[PDB]
Design a protein around this ligand. Structure first.
Ligand SMILES: *[C@@H]1O[C@H](CO)[C@@H](O[C@@H]2O[C@H](CO)[C@@H](O[C@H]3O[C@H](CO)[C@@H](O)[C@H](O[C@H]4O[C@H](CO)[C@@H](O)[C@H](O)[C@@H]4O)[C@@H]3O)[C@H](O)[C@H]2NC(C)=O)[C@H](O)[C@H]1NC(C)=O
Ligand SMILES: *[C@@H]1O[C@H](CO)[C@@H](O[C@@H]2O[C@H](CO)[C@@H](O[C@H]3O[C@H](CO)[C@@H](O)[C@H](O[C@H]4O[C@H](CO)[C@@H](O)[C@H](O)[C@@H]4O)[C@@H]3O)[C@H](O)[C@H]2NC(C)=O)[C@H](O)[C@H]1NC(C)=O
Ligand SMILES: *[C@@H]1O[C@H](CO)[C@@H](O[C@@H]2O[C@H](CO)[C@@H](O[C@H]3O[C@H](CO)[C@@H](O)[C@H](O)[C@@H]3O)[C@H](O)[C@H]2NC(C)=O)[C@H](O)[C@H]1NC(C)=O
Ligand SMILES: *[C@@H]1O[C@H](CO)[C@@H](O[C@@H]2O[C@H](CO)[C@@H](O[C@H]3O[C@H](CO)[C@@H](O)[C@H](O)[C@@H]3O)[C@H](O)[C@H]2NC(C)=O)[C@H](O)[C@H]1NC(C)=O
Ligand SMILES: [Cl-]
Ligand SMILES: [Cl-]
Lengths: 29, 426, 426
């Protein structure tokens, strides 16, 4: 599962999910 | 002459499937069985040193857990780590233990990235992985004719462990690794009414095979609205990704199973809608040793841990800690049996990997990647009483779907609807 | 009587703007100035203990750095941490130092999440932040009439620090915090030709005001393709997010500045396209003390560090470590001056926060959030020689755009094109 994606596979640290930029969402802080 | 096992888990918060009040007694049972077995580490006294993964607020933390790990590594120099179960706790701890070359054992940490064992070296996962859910969904689509389009909705936030994000990530990546069909995915916030028009609109514009990871109440509200909006099982199928069966009761009693029942007036409407709904869960271990383990776990947790262990799929986590711990002692025993030592993490780890084992959870297979194969169930209501029951099981090691108690996957049409409608989604 | 300063930076790899071969001599210059000043920490002997944020391969690490931090905290019990500069190094360490209640100082770690000081307590950032880029982009749109739509392309991957992701994240969040206009964002892989048809297509369907964070060569290729596809400055404007001016030489010599020049055959076509392109960078400190600092940093790095410090915007990082350190010693001096101690992290931190200071970088303001306000320049070619020069400056503390050397923002039409075309993008 070393495939590339804009949302998934980007390390495990809360620093990579502060904005969910590359992830289609409906939210923000 | 003695083997020290460092534990990093929620030592005080009892809310987690891998909470110590629940994994502690399973581990005590496991150690008791190592004593009884003269074929497992004879004469050694396995010692347990504990550290808590939880922060000041009591929830598992990306900071308390790695700090507790360093604290145990220098105070006690252990041979193996047990836990953490939270993803954000396990990722920094797992990175430490890989650098230390100390083996790590956990029935939690199911995230896609812990799967990268080139980074998470000597991490062995004896519980579920979220890529394994991708395996089930794959076998489901192949064995049902959905080779085109699926939609995935998942509740998400910041503040918890984002379990639906990591579930969906695992499903998403593994499904597109194997089927490479179009899988759309959208994140919503459960408590926000703004998102439910957006979701419903996506449901009808983005898929007919739809997977929702969310709380039971949110999944129920989406079904009621899909009904209210004319979305029926002749054209849609909604899978609730409810791996721990939060929407269901205990498989031991509580006959029957009505997730749509809430006592809120909509129970009639909700059961109509749930005819288009199926529920994906982990499989309840069926073997007799599992039930005996549960009885003993409950006794030990009430007595030595002042905790009351209730029935439910969450108990596969302490059972898998129990089994993984025994699987480790076997490997250490064999490692010592060929001149090795309890610090030969690589040798010990490879003995555990690509290996089948018999535990209180029954058959359990560790794959070549060091992750336990995960079995899944599929629930479905029959139109008669509207009660949901297991109609399909998935054996993660053989990747086979087998019908259950001669039941059939209820379809309002008679067969599954196609992932694309008659024309386009437009 | 002596103040231990723990350092966690790349101690061996010299590729980083916060590499020790570059921050080391700047910190040594700073400590020498503390000595010379009888008004800063009189009679104290400030000690430096070093740990490396970098892993076995030599790159800054989410694991080496927090391990290095714990090691320094228990061996030397320091009063302050310096660094890390990498985002993935600084997030675990910053969470550790917040838990220890030890102040942390860094001119790196510009990520949006480090800004959440309720988590990263006692973290003071004396270098650039990526939310500050959002401030500049906001002031740019307000002062130019783009209140509708913008598109952000950024080159991202896994394996490095994902600097374009964190750059874009900060821009995206702060811009929608302040303007709440529609900002589309698409990520590409630089070395993958598959993405360039996708990018070009998005450029014409998703915006006319376009920000690209990418390598200079990628940004050049995109312009050449935009020209090749009929995208001119009468209707598009491409901002290259190049904060360290990788696409430009040094502001000291190398007159003039031609990012489109490459000697590859396309230099003629590339200059045509670059007429539609402007370049956003950090601002070179203009004060005379900065140039004196550079001369001394260069000398000290060549002599005691066997490193050759070349000119360029990257030097604002070791300059900002230098200034941040003196800012801290002032606060410690004032804290001692009112009965405090060198371990009163909160008092020391609040003295540093919401405060203006004079350093080798000139005027620098730490805002209420503990982050330095960041000044930005905007480069633009005049049509005469096609050379790019600063034509606009942004003062992050006053949030002002002011014209530079009476220059004007070159527009092929005479004025900036509208963020929406005449009709829709369709
Ligand atoms: C999910 O699918 C898995 C995929 O196969 C199933 O695995 C299989 O499990 C069986 C046992 O349940 C296992 O069988 C044999 O295993 C031994 C190793 O080869 C072998 O020596 C055994 O033979 C002995 O015992 C039998 C009686 O059981 C005697 O009759 C024999 O003469 C012999 O003395 C045994 O036959 C398979 O190897 C194993 N397959 C794989 C591929 O690992 C899981 O059981 C299944 N899980 C569930 C819950 O259904
Ligand atoms: C980016 O914008 C910032 C936003 O204002 C600018 O800030 C200003 O910088 C000036 C000095 O550069 C500063 O001025 C006064 O600051 C002292 C504190 O109030 C005050 O005591 C000073 O007065 C003394 O010295 C002057 C000579 O300078 C004498 O004539 C006076 O009689 C007095 O004895 C000084 O006047 C502003 O306070 C400060 N503003 C803010 C809001 O902080 C930045 O300078 C600007 N940076 C760049 C590089 O352009
Ligand atoms: C045991 O663990 C429980 C789950 O891990 C935990 O529940 C949760 O409690 C947190 C608070 O720690 C709630 O979170 C919030 O986080 C920030 C922190 O300030 C707030 O500002 C937010 O508004 C947000 O509400 C979770 O929502 C909550 N979740 C659930 C499912 O309960 C328990 O509190 C823990 N119990 C003990 C005794 O430690
Ligand atoms: C000093 O730091 C440099 C930047 O941090 C670093 O550069 C880069 O080197 C890494 C390898 O460490 C390259 O990365 C790759 O990572 C995996 C490792 O298994 C490979 O499989 C991938 O294919 C990928 O190529 C980076 O691409 C490279 N980047 C740049 C801009 O140079 C230097 O190597 C470091 N030098 C020393 C002496 O430590
Ligand atoms: Cl945990
Ligand atoms: Cl660093």
């Amino acid at each position: 599962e070393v495939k590339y994606d804009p949302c998934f596979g980007h390390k495990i640290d809360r620093i990579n999910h502060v904005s969910n930029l590359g992830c289609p969402s409906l939210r923000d802080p | 002459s003695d083997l020290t096992v460092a534990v990093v888990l929620p030592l005080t918060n009892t809310s987690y499937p891998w909470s110590w009040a629940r994994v502690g007694p399973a581990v005590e049972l496991a150690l008791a069985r190592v004593k009884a077995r003269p074929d497992l580490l004879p004469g050694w006294t396995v010692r347990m040193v504990l550290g808590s993964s939880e922060n000041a607020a009591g929830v598992c933390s990306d900071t308390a857990a790695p700090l507790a790990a360093v604290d145990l590594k220098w105070e006690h120099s252990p041979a193996v780590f047990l836990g953490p179960g939270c993803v954000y706790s396990a990722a920094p701890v797992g990175r430490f233990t890989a650098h230390w070359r100390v083996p790590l054992l956990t029935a939690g940490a199911p995230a896609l990235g812990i799967g990268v064992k080139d980074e998470y070296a000597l991490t062995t996962r004896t519980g579920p992985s979220h890529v394994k859910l991708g395996d089930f969904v794959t076998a489901l689509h192949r064995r049902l004719g959905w080779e085109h389009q699926a939609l995935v909705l998942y509740a998400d936030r910041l503040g918890d462990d984002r379990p639906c994000f990591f579930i969906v990530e695992g499903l998403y990546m593994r499904v597109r690794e194997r089927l490479n069909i179009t899988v759309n995915h959208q994140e919503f916030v459960e408590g926000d009414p703004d998102h439910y028009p957006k979701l419903l609109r996506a449901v009808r514009r983005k898929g007919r095979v739809i997977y929702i990871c969310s709380s039971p109440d949110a999944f129920r509200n989406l079904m009621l609205l899909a009904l209210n909006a004319g979305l029926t099982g002749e054209d849609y199928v909604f899978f609730h990704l409810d791996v721990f069966g939060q929407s269901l009761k205990s498989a031991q009693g509580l006959v029957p199973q009505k997730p749509w029942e809430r006592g809120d007036g909509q129970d009639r409407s909700a059961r109509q809608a749930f005819q288009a709904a199926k529920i994906i869960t982990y499989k309840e271990p069926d073997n007799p040793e599992y039930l005996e383990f549960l009885k003993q776990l409950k006794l030990l947790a009430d007595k030595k841990f002042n905790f009351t262990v209730e029935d439910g799929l969450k108990n596969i986590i302490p059972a898998s800690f129990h089994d993984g711990l025994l699987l480790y002692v076997q490997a250490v025993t064999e490692t010592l049996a060929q001149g090795g030592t309890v610090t030969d993490g690589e040798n010990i780890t490879q003995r555990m990997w690509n290996r089948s084992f018999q535990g209180v959870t029954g058959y359990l297979k560790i794959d070549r990647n060091g992750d336990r194969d995960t079995d899944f169930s599929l629930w479905d209501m029959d139109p008669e009483t509207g009660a949901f029951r297991v109609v399909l099981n998935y054996n993660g090691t053989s990747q086979e779907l087998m019908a259950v108690s001669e039941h059939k996957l209820y379809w309002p049409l008679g067969y599954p609807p196609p992932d694309v409608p008659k024309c386009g989604f437009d």
